[PDB]
Design a protein around this nucleic acid. Structure first.
Length: 564
DNA sequence: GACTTT
DNA sequence: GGACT
DNA sequence: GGACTT
């Protein structure tokens, strides 16, 4: 069958002169077959002849260079696999999955080279993959901005970095493929594995294909994690506190919660209790005002709302979310419009989760990471959007890539109600624990609650455990902290030296402090600049790479990052 | 609701 | 915090 | 065909 290669480019960083200055490829099955060179023309000649499957890490980047070349070297876009054309899978939202370059046919053979994104398989930076998969990695980075003219001679040091980059991804992908995880994406692998375990026969019976109209209604109720900063603590210096984190939040909901299956039944007005269809999604219009003493749960944000402010809220809510809302808010002018009710059961994920949890628990390094990936990448596939209308590349007048929305396309839904309820139960888990600890609650993010003080609250003692699925682990304790916004905080965390290594400590048992920085969108280089003294709204650094399409490819231009 | 790449 | 060219 | 979320 087809050979597989791990590939990379190094590129120049001038908007007026953007080009590949190095390429590397390495056979994923035979890491001894590899080549590094300084010509995209040379690389692409190989691409056209190799009739293989190629992988770049973060194809959205390298892919720009490839398409720029194709468009200048006699290839046009086609969905239909015509000779001397290329097809793509680029989503509406700009996720890159595939470039398929068609040469035509020779004798019986379809001649093509397919290029995939290894980031879809291994959703971490290369450096993190090497660390977690226990693979050899060289310290440091290439000097990105060094002056490199056309034909620039690659140094031994640059060559070694490029070889290491492609070999890390080759090693990681080979391990993944040897486990049987050889579909296009981590989520696709997870879903296939789940079907293997429950059987396709059962899957089809219990997760029937919903009409596009019904799927759209269900999807209105699909929301993600609960992330919230208590205004009481916004931009304030905090003393001691502690963090609890659920042990495997989403798998825990899948393992034990009542979850929907089967063909829904539509109803008008307000849901009437049906023990046989005990879960529902309710379309409701209302105004609302948060009750004193309660955490807000309605996001229409980023922020969770205290009030509808005279704008009528038009919501589709799972019963889990609806009951939270009714408890946390006073509701006014309520109109129950319509909804959908579902059969439900526990246990649909037991065997899958048991299998991969065992592998996780009994394995190390690479295989352990893959078990985590299988467990973590399943729920999201249930709410896959049946609208798969994509984006088509083209060369703009200036010679840079532009993208147009392509032809309308739909596919079958998977089973969106399952996604709606998995995330609803996850939110319920976190919101209810935070609410129980209302007097001390600082911040929530998805599976974690942060409290003032250092003693475990009595009200959650019985649901705290360092390891047990779905319980809250006491993750850390801090000496001081500062929270500016959602996903934007720092902590001085108590640590202790054990066996010559630093691990989480406590106020009564610490040796040192770990200074921890969390800020969404902040790069690691910018994180190095942060201190307790300078961490405030208005903190700014012109150090955030932003991708710009230019003639030849993409330049990552350093842009201003500001805490707003 | 992306999350990485030079 | 906020990309989706 | 493929393709977690918008």
């Amino acid at each position: 069958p087809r050979k597989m290669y791990s590939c990379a480019f190094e590129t120049t960083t001038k908007v007026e002169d953007c080009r590949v200055w190095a390429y590397g490829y390495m056979n994923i099955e035979d890491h001894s077959e590899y080549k590094i060179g300084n010509s995209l023309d040379e690389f692409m000649a190989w691409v056209l002849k190799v009739q293989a499957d190629l992988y770049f890490h973060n194809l959205k980047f390298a892919g720009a260079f490839i398409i720029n070349w194709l468009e200048r070297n006699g290839f046009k876009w086609s969905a239909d696999g015509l000779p001397n054309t290329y097809n793509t899978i680029i989503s509406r939202m700009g996720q890159w999955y595939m470039i398929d370059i068609c040469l035509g046919y020779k004798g019986k053979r379809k001649i093509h080279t397919v290029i995939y994104d290894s980031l879809k398989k291994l959703p971490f930076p290369v450096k993190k993959i090497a660390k977690d998969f226990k693979l050899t990695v060289l310290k440091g980075d290439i000097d990105y901005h060094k002056e490199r003219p056309v034909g620039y001679k690659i140094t031994p040091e640059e060559y070694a970095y490029i070889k290491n980059d492609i070999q890390i991804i080759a090693e990681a992908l080979l391990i993944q493929f040897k486990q049987g995880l050889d579909r296009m994406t981590a989520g696709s692998d997870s879903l296939k594995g789940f079907k293997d375990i429950i059987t396709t026969k059962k899957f089809k019976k219990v997760f029937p294909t919903l009409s596009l109209g019904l799927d759209k209604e269900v999807r209105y109720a699909y929301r993600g994690g609960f992330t919230w900063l208590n205004d009481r603590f916004k931009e304030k210096e905090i003393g001691e506190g502690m963090v609890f984190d659920v042990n495997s939040l989403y798998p825990a909901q899948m393992y034990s919660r009542l979850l929907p299956y089967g063909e829904p039944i539509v109803f008008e007005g307000k849901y009437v209790w049906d023990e046989d269809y005990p879960l529902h999604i309710q379309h409701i219009r209302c105004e609302f005002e948060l009750k004193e003493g309660y955490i807000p749960t309605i996001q229409i944000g980023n922020e969770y709302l205290k009030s509808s402010g005279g704008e009528i809220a038009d919501l589709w809510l799972s019963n889990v979310d609806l009951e939270l809302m009714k408890e946390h808010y006073d509701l006014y002018n309520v109109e129950y419009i319509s909804g959908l009710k579902f059969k439900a059961t526990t246990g649909l994920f037991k065997d899958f989760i048991d299998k991969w949890t065992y592998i996780k628990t009994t394995s190390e390094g690479a295989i352990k990471q893959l078990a985590k990936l299988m467990l973590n990448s399943l729920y999201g596939k249930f709410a896959s959007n049946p609208d798969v209308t994509g984006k088509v590349p083209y060369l703009k007048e200036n010679g840079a890539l532009g993208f147009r929305l392509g032809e309308e396309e739909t596919k079958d839904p998977v089973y969106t109600p399952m996604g709606v309820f998995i995330t609803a139960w996850a939110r319920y888990t976190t919101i209810t624990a935070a609410q129980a600890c209302y007097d001390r609650i600082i911040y929530c993010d998805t599976d974690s609650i942060h409290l003032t003080g250092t003693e475990i609250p009595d009200v959650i003692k019985d649901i705290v455990d360092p390891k047990k699925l779905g319980y809250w682990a006491h993750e850390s304790t801090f000496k001081r902290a500062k929270y500016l916004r959602q996903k934007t905080y720092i902590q001085d965390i108590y640590m202790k030296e054990v066996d010559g290594k630093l691990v989480e400590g406590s106020p009564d048992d610490y040796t040192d402090i770990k200074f921890s920085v969390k800020c969404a969108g902040m790069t690691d280089k910018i994180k190095k600049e942060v201190t307790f003294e300078n961490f405030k709204v208005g903190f700014s650094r012109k150090m955030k790479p932003k991708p710009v399409q230019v003639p030849g490819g993409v330049v990552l231009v350093d842009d201003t990052f500001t805490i707003k």
